[PDB]
A paper describes a structure:
The MRE11-RAD50-NBS1 (MRN) complex is a central, multifunctional factor in the detection, signaling and nucleolytic processing of DNA double-strand breaks (DSBs). The core MR complex contains two copies of both the ATPase RAD50 and the endo-/exonuclease MRE11, assembled in an elongated structure. This structure consists of a “head” module which includes MRE11 and the ATP binding cassette type nucleotide binding domains (NBDs) of RAD50, and a “tail” module formed by the coiled-coil domains (CCDs) of RAD50. Furthermore, MRN/X’s nuclease is highly regulated by trans-interacting factors that interact with a regulatory surface patch on RAD50, denoted “S site”.
The highest resolution structures were obtained by incubating MR or MH129NRN (nuclease dead mutant, hereafter referred to as ‘MRN’) with 50 bp DNA and ATP at 35 °C for 30 min, followed by addition of BeFx (producing the ATP mimic ADP•BeFx after ATP hydrolysis). Extensive processing resulted in 3D reconstructions with overall resolutions of 3.2 Å (MR) and 3.1 Å (MRN). The maps resolve MR’s and MRN’s catalytic head bound to DNA and parts of the CCD module, with ADP•BeFx•Mg2+ bound at both active sites. Human MR/MRN comprises two tightly engaged RAD50NBDs that bind into the concave side of the MRE11 dimer. The nuclease active site of MRE11 harbors density consistent with two Mn2+ ions (present in the buffer) but is shielded from any DNA access by the proximity of RAD50NBDs. DNA interacts with both RAD50NBDs in a two-fold symmetric manner, traversing the RAD50 dimer between the CCDs with a footprint of ~20 bases, consistent with ATP dependent DNA binding. The 3’ strand, as viewed from a DSB, binds to the RAD50NBD N-lobe along the top β-strand of the S site and to the subsequent α-helix, while the 5’ strand binds the N-lobe at a loop following the P-loop helix (Walker A motif). MRE11 does not substantially contribute to DNA binding in this state, with only a single residue (K467MRE11) at the HLH element in sufficient proximity to the 3’ strand. DNA interactions are virtually identical in MR and in MRN complexes. During 3D classification, we identified two separable conformational states in MR and MRN, one with the MRE11 dimer symmetrically attached to both RAD50NBDs, and one where the MRE11 catalytic domain dimer detaches as a rigid body from one RAD50NBD.
Residue numbers in the entry:
A (entry chain D): 8 to 401, 427 to 511
B (entry chain B): 1 to 245, 1071 to 1312
C (entry chain A): 1 to 243, 1069 to 1312
D (entry chain E): 7 to 401, 426 to 509
DNA sequence: AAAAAAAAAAAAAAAAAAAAAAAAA
DNA sequence: TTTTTTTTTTTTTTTTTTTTTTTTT
């Protein structure tokens, strides 16, 4: 470290108010932000670079906004002077506000460690005047909101220029934008990154972007190929998986850092990796990133079980397989809890309630058990008593009625109607559209039986007529 | 596949009459958001979509109230015209249109449907065939790739009919019957029962006539036997007269002849002139009709059992989807899962005056299967109906991405709203990977819109608000002007 | 001045069987906000209040599902009890405790209303006398000062049985004949109709009875005439020829005598013994019954007209209130006001199979009186039903100021919700002088509660939520954690 | 006259920010009046701004209203001008419930020119687990000193805010908008105390700021005059949008009561028709002098109360076209009030063009109100409230008599056939009153058998006309 | 353009059930 | 105290009328 080291405590996706109403999950994101601010203060970083999503809710509640403002007043404010200057015109980068200057450039506030930040997809400008929570913070004089897009047609990313000694930074900001729109602008070359004209090649070009990185949709993701080649690093933000280690791009030769969220917002198998915040050190045109673990975030452990992939203790038929799968999941959850207990040693700040998830795929024909009676076991032992277990998986009426009529004609005794005679009338009704097929068949059989009975001169006796019609039905069906 | 593109609502409900007031709404992908004040014609757009797709008016109303009221418009008649532009399953553009008129005939309002037009673009030529309602419905069904019952209940469910999965047994059975495309067989069941009932009434009538005729048969046989007896006595008197050869016996014979001729006249009376054959034939008819009635009872029972077995077999597959959706999107700890259970009636018969239908959805609290209908919460009922509709869309409709939720978060609480928004986001993400999916959402809450728009972001919504002339205006606004309408 | 005070729920819906989960809720004044997740017991509390006040179970459910299910409780029988402590119009403390037992047997559960208690202080008497259901109901109605219909519809309206003003003609007619206490006269109307229809079916039977009696009368008269002619011939021949032909005469005498005796024995058969008298009597009965049917039809028509006139006479004042309430509450210039209009059918007869009722709520859009039912939005329907209930509460409920609004802001946009909050605040302010108003809003909207809390402040609200074993515990929370439950 | 011993306090109350912020006509109306209040404070060189609560209309202010409030407070309340008074009281009690108990201008990182001492109103009362309000957000941002908030529901102890400028000592008592029922209980129970200064309690102005109801028909829900602290010298009183800003003593209270009133017409009651003003209190040791200042940016409000019963010359009850006369009279009243607004407008140039005009009609003698939807369509573009222009407000029938009248009228109109006259009316009366399931089929039975019997005994031939002729003759013998 | 015949639904009606009241024991 | 019998209410399936649709004239 020297007069030219640009120590920047890069953080990203510090959601605030995530499960604030939750009794056990509340007051956890605020603790993580407090730890982040403590790290920045202890390390004497020049400023904090937030990648967006500083607030989970688009309109943060009173509690979250108040806690964030209290933490900012406690840490970001101080008597320490700022060792770097801004060479870009602040009337453009922060020109949206009625005070278009950086917070420490204002004489009414004594800012020690400023906080440059962009806006994520959770807190983006919405409203008639296009306000965001970061805009409220900037109006209060705590956070320098930069990189906001000011147009819906063309995005001209004007950088904010920083100078500490001989080290120069061209900080580019791009707030989160609807992903399809940003992709359609990238393919149509409607986005241009303005560069400082003086000393063009000596600026350490830094880019902060809040966009999808992995395979999410056809247009709902920003491939790295569309970013300009002149960038040197690109913090990424929208991805909550922790990838603090910069990665080399074999196609364009610019580094990529993915700080990842501080808190586990989603139960995907990407948040299981421990969350770290970066500590960027920049000298001239050389970047060195040192990660610092977060000890105030509850561990997230999840495992994937495919019952169809275990044809050894989970037989598809297995009349007593519900107990087997329930016991297997019980042992899995218990092992996860033991692992959480054994890793919690040496850490007095990590909350004593791990996040436990268990995705089960019964694609083989198994049936899920009660998630509602297999969580009562871990009501007070996990931080998510409800989402402990997730269950997911990856004939014609004519034939049925024909077979039912076939069974009926052979199971019961027909008095007058011929064997296999209605069933072919119902098929005529439903297939040939003849709306009087049943009536016509019934009347035909009635008339035939009446004519036969008249011809044979039966007596007016119930038993005699019954026997006669039975014998007629049993003899005339042959031909 | 099968994505709707444009609409032109004119003269329907509060929409204006003249061409100047004809409104155009373009449906976005994957999420179209409709907001506005109470009234103003937000649901009317879904009603027009359903009417142009299927030809069915909103439940509880007919064409008299669907069209703009001529009394309100101060005109002798009102002509409405809905036009829908959409791509069919293959991808060709079609511009179906339907027209109706509601003339003011004295106090009442007469309604009539004009011939619609089908516009299939082909090699740069826009044909226009003035087809009738039947061809229009057939072409709409063949183009959208889904059945009429699906369009009515799963896709374009009315706001007042949105809780149809939790209706009575008869209504629920009929809904899942037309949905399962097995309504012809229940029409056959209905005509079987009607034929047995008419035959039973005819059998009852024959039996009173039988009372009257048996009396006629007995009278005819008694007088025939008495005639034979008198003829025998006449022969005996003649033999006695021959033995004497007696004038008193001659007078006896004359009186016997008078008796014989008078009773032969009596036999000639049409009351019992041919009662021997008539009574026998009518008894034969009664017996054969009652035997056919018994056979009709047996066949009606067999067909009823077959139809419910088919219903249960078809429901077995979608029950798993319903269970998975309920487990994923129900935040409460009340019900483990829900499913639809259909139970056939073992004692059913065509002679029953009133039937018993056991079609129901069940809340399985713990291990006991309860009856969800009646004892469920209002929000629980709303969520259950929404889950049933989503599962029905997942199963049957794979060639019609549209689904259209008229205020889905009606009685849902905070966490249920959040879970429903998460589920809808997952549905959008899963179904839009390969084929087009549209999720028209009329709504009045802005915490649901935010949760929905966090993923698969919406950029333009539609504000549907009335104007000075009290028509309905469909205007397009950017997301920046969204909070002025929703609460 | 009836004021509910506290009430305990045990074994009802999901509230626990043992006497340890007996949740107690103390109703505040003038605002008692109930919040909680989906399920819980929010509407169950109003159901219990209505059951205690009137004895009527929630719609769509009999007593079988109201009680805690024995299968879910894993018990053979479940004993439920609700104890309400309140003050009557004279400001004296009364406590009524109803009981019920599900006692499920075999597969089908049962129900039985145990004897209630009318515990009431009389110089410290606290007499817990046991009363039957009828005595309990009559005592509650007398003490609260409001009829059963008002308590069932206006005060404690079930969530499912809301928008009952926007119901069919017959349903609305029989809800405003029980609110207007005219049920006895319409029960007499139905008795008149049933009597007329019974006499018409007797007359229809008498048609064929008269036909057959006429046939018998013709036969009997023919045989009598032929008897008299034969007797005249016999005597004339006797006295002509008695004064060879002499014995031929005697033979003719014996022939005529046998003819006479056989004819007379044919006469003594019951079908002809005296058929003139039977035919006359049956004709007399038929004509008398037909004239009585005419008179019954006239009387039924005039009594129906009188009942409809009385309904209009009350409805004019209720509509005078409804118009003001709607014009003050509805935030939209498309319906000028609403009212409830009824008129008797012109061609009404006691013999009609279907009688069409014309009781409806009419929207006055512009200058025409359209009918609200079938052409109103969900929001307008909700607002109109709430306004009609509020109007009926001002007119009929002046000795009971309880009014339970179960999720009033359903399908209501922002402006209408603010206007409804303002109207409710004004109602509370105006009806809280010299009386004790009590609102029981049960909502899931944070904004509505926050508007209702600026005036007529809430110090404590009741949050209903489940516990570990799904029992719907009722917990009383001060106003420092309201946002934990509202959306 | 101002000197080193003259506290220049700008007294504002019920600003109600964010009122109808989504209305096109009256959206930015409140942030214009707030801007004028702050400009008046700045151009008067006031020591500090005292607020009587209800600064925010919504309990949870939206992003736009909060952002505009922060913008105006940063623009005006913040500056390099030093403060001229000191707080000689422990700030950990009055400015409690915050992690920065010191006053906003005593912070070393804040440059506050005109401090704002504000209490919380009923609209923005503290709600939540931590009991925070929008005033707490403004205090944490470092703009407004939220004071006078109640501690516990058991008892309230109003800790004073002791500030002085030279020889002028003023104790700033403050009370939040506690629900008015609790305050009546807490006054009759004497569970209230105002801690006097620890020493020299003679030289203190004892300025008390309260935001509660006042004299109204709600006797249970208001705090009456006196019934308070007796040694106060000025009780600013908010929650009363009617402007009575002139401090007027009562018959025997010995303390002046000021009612600054709101800065925006929130409700359309006749009380708010008066002009809105601003305080500009001046205190010199113990002397009070408040100079009201008109608020030009406040929208005009015109209310006229008319009743149709007191104008019988023109409004004749039972008239074919009285509704047209009423509509014409209301139209003339609206036109005269709009013209009055136009005339009053030209005296200045800051009032919004569209005035708030509304009249209430009290038809009680029997009148059909005109279509208020057609009276007010003639005024879409000339009134700020196009919907609330006209307000309409106001202030035996036995079934037995009706059914008897209808029965007798029907009997007199159409003659009967067999039924005796007036019999079935009493029959149905007995059925209803005596609630027995008889007297209808029994009256029919009785009458049928009497008539049938007679018709036989009289030996009547079985034909059509004669039987009904004789039954009519038998019926007529009843009278 | 007209007649009349039929298909559809919705709203009133009726069957069936299930509990309460009674009325015998 | 139990049992059986009839009464009354309600949920929900059924029927009726009317209006639009379809076919012929
Ligand atoms: N036949 C009709 N003629 C005129 N106006 C009608 C007619 N039917 C309904 N309306 C009105 O048109 C509007 C339709 O409301 P709707 O679209 O259902 O509301 P929402 O969009 O809030 O769900 C309402 O104002 C309704 O009163
Ligand atoms: N007979 C019953 N036995 C057990 N639980 C029941 C029974 N009937 C209803 N429930 C459950 O009890 C609760 C009653 O819901 P309700 O109080 O109406 O809900 P809400 O308060 O949300 O309007 C629901 O969770 C419902 O599923
Ligand atoms: F379903 Be609950 F009544 F909101
Ligand atoms: F009642 Be509307 F559909 F908002
Ligand atoms: Mg709607
Ligand atoms: Mg409810
Ligand atoms: Mn994030
Ligand atoms: Mn106030």
């Amino acid at each position: 470290d020297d007069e030219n080291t640009f120590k920047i405590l890069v953080a990203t996706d510090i959601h605030l108010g995530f499960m604030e109403k939750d009794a056990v999950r509340g007051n956890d994101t605020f603790v993580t932000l407090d730890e982040i601010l403590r790290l920045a203060q202890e390390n004497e970083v020049d400023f904090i670079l937030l990648g967006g999503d500083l607030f989970h809710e688009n309109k943060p509640s009173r509690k979250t906004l108040h806690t964030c403002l209290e933490l900012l007043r406690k840490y970001c404010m101080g008597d320490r002077p700022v060792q770097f200057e801004i060479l870009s015109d602040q009337s453009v980068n922060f020109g949206f506000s009625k005070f278009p200057w950086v917070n420490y450039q204002d004489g009414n506030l004594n800012i020690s460690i400023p906080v440059f930040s962009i806006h994520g997809n959770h807190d983006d400008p919405t409203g008639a005047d296009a306000l965001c929570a970061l805009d409220i913070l900037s109006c209060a004089g705590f956070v320098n909101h930069f990189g906001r897009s000011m147009s819906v047609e063309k995005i001209d990313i004007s950088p904010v220029l920083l100078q500490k000694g001989s080290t120069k930074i061209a900080l580019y900001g791009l707030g989160s934008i609807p992903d399809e729109r940003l992709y359609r602008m990238f393919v149509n070359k409607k986005v241009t990154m303005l560069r400082p004209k003086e000393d063009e090649n000596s600026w350490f070009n830094l880019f902060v972007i809040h966009q999808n990185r992995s395979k999410h949709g056809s247009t709902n993701f920003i491939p790295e190929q569309f970013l300009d080649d002149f960038i040197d690093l690109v913090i990424w933000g929208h991805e909550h998986e922790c990838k603090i280690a910069p990665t080399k791009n074999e196609q364009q030769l610019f580094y990529i850092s993915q700080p990842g969220s501080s808190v586990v917002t989603s139960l995907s198998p990407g948040e299981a990796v421990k969350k770290h915040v970066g500590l960027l050190r920049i000298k001239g045109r050389k970047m060195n990133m040192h990660k610092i673990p977060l000890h105030t975030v509850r561990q997230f452990f999840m495992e994937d079980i495919v019952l169809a992939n275990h044809p050894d203790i989970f037989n598809p038929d297995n009349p007593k397989v519900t107990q087997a799968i329930q016991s297997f999941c019980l042992e899995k959850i218990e092992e996860m809890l033991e692992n959480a207990e054994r890793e919690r040693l040496g850490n007095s700040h990590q909350p004593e309630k791990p996040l436990v998830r268990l995705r089960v795929d019964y694609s083989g024909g198994f049936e899920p058990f009660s998630v509602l009676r297999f969580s009562q076991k871990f009501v007070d032992r996990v931080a998510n008593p409800k989402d402990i277990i997730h269950f997911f998986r990856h004939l014609r009426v004519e034939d049925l009625v024909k077979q039912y009529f076939q069974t009926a004609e052979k199971n019961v005794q027909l008095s007058l109607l011929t064997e296999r005679g209605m069933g072919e009338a119902v098929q005529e009704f439903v297939d040939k559209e003849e709306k009087d097929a049943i009536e016509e068949l019934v009347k035909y059989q009635l008339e035939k039986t009446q004519r036969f009975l008249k011809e044979r001169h039966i007596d007016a006796l119930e038993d005699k007529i019954d026997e006669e019609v039975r014998r007629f039905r049993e003899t005339r069906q042959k031909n | 596949m099968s994505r709707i593109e444009k609409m032109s609502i004119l003269g329907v409900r509060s929409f204006g009459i003249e061409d100047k007031d004809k409104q155009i709404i373009t449906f976005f992908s994957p999420l179209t958001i409709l907001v506005g004040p109470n009234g103003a014609g937000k649901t009317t757009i879904i009603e027009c979509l359903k009417y142009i797709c299927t030809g069915d008016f909103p439940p509880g109303t007919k064409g008299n109230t669907f069209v703009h009221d001529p009394k309100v418009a101060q005109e002798t008649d009102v002509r409405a015209q809905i036009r829908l532009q959409f791509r069919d399953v293959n991808g060709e553009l079609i511009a179906v249109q339907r027209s109706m008129v509601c003339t003011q005939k004295s106090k009442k309002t007469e309604f009539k449907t004009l011939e619609g037009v089908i516009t299939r673009t082909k090699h740069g030529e826009k044909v226009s065939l003035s087809s009738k309602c039947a061809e229009i419905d057939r072409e709409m069904i063949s183009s959208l790739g889904v059945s009429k019952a699906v369009l009515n209940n799963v896709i374009f469910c009315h706001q007042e009919d949105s809780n149809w999965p939790l209706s009575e047994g008869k209504a629920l059975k009929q809904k899942f019957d037309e949905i399962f495309s097995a309504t012809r067989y229940i029409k056959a069941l209905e005509t079987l029962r009607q034929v047995r009932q008419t035959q039973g009434q005819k059998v009852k009538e024959y039996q009173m006539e039988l009372k009257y005729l048996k009396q006629y048969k007995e009278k005819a046989c008694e007088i025939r036997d008495q005639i034979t007896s008198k003829e025998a006595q006449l022969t005996s008197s003649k033999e006695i007269v021959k033995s004497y050869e007696h004038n008193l016996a001659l007078g006896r014979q004359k009186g016997y002849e008078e008796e014989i001729i008078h009773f032969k006249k009596e036999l000639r009376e049409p009351q019992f002139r041919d009662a021997e054959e008539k009574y026998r034939e009518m008894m034969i008819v009664m017996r054969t009709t009652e035997l056919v009635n018994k056979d009709l009872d047996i066949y009606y029972k067999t067909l009823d059992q077959a139809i419910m077995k088919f219903h249960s077999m078809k429901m077995e597959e979608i029950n798993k989807i319903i269970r998975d959706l309920w487990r994923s999107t129900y935040r409460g700890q009340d019900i483990e899962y829900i499913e639809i259970r259909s139970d056939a009636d073992e004692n059913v018969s065509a002679s029953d005056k009133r039937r018993n239908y056991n079609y129901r959805v069940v809340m399985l609290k713990g291990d006991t299967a309860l009856d969800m209908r009646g004892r469920c919460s209002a929000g629980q009922k709303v969520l259950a109906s929404l889950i049933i509709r989503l599962a029905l869309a997942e199963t049957f409709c794979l060639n019609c991405g549209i689904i259209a939720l008229d205020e889905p978060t009606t009685n849902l609480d905070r966490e249920n709203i959040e879970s429903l928004a998460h589920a809808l986001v997952e549905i959008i993400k899963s179904r839009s990977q390969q084929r087009n999916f549209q999720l028209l959402v009329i709504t009045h809450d802005e915490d649901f819109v935010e949760l929905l728009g966090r993923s698969e972001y919406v950029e333009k919504f539609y504000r549907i608000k009335k104007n000075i002339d009290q028509c309905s205006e469909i205007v397009k606004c950017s997301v920046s002007s969204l909070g002025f309408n929703v609460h």
